[PDB]
């Protein structure tokens, strides 16, 4: 459902700030910015892993369907 991606990220990574946009408005492919203190000192690969974990396999094709930008809070 709409908002479900954002909900799962925030449930799985407590304290995360999430910005989700629906690429092409197609209800299929998305881009997400996730900012979380738990990401500080982790590599981008490590941060993305935490986001994939948060989605708990609910999003088919997530490797290509959820384009990620992650960072520690500024």
| Contact residues for Co ion, defined by CB under 5 A | 61, 65
What six digits make up the tokens of 29? 């492919």
CB of 6 to Co ion, least distance (A): 19
In this chain, which residue has its C-beta nearest to Co ion? 61
CB of 25 to Co ion, least distance (A): 15
CB of 27 to Co ion, least distance (A): 11
Nearer Cβ to Co ion, position 43 or 58? 58
d(CA 21, CA 1): 14
From the list 17, 1, 9, the residue with the least C-alpha distance to 52 is 9
């Amino acid at each position: 459902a709409p908002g479900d991606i954002e909900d799962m990220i925030k449930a799985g990574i407590p304290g995360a700030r999430v910005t989700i946009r629906d690429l092409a408005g197609d209800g299929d492919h998305y881009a997400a910015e996730v900012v979380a203190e738990a990401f500080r000192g982790k590599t981008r690969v490590q941060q993305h892993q935490m986001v994939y974990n948060a989605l708990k396999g609910n999003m088919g094709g997530i490797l290509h369907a959820l384009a990620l930008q992650t960072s520690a809070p500024e």
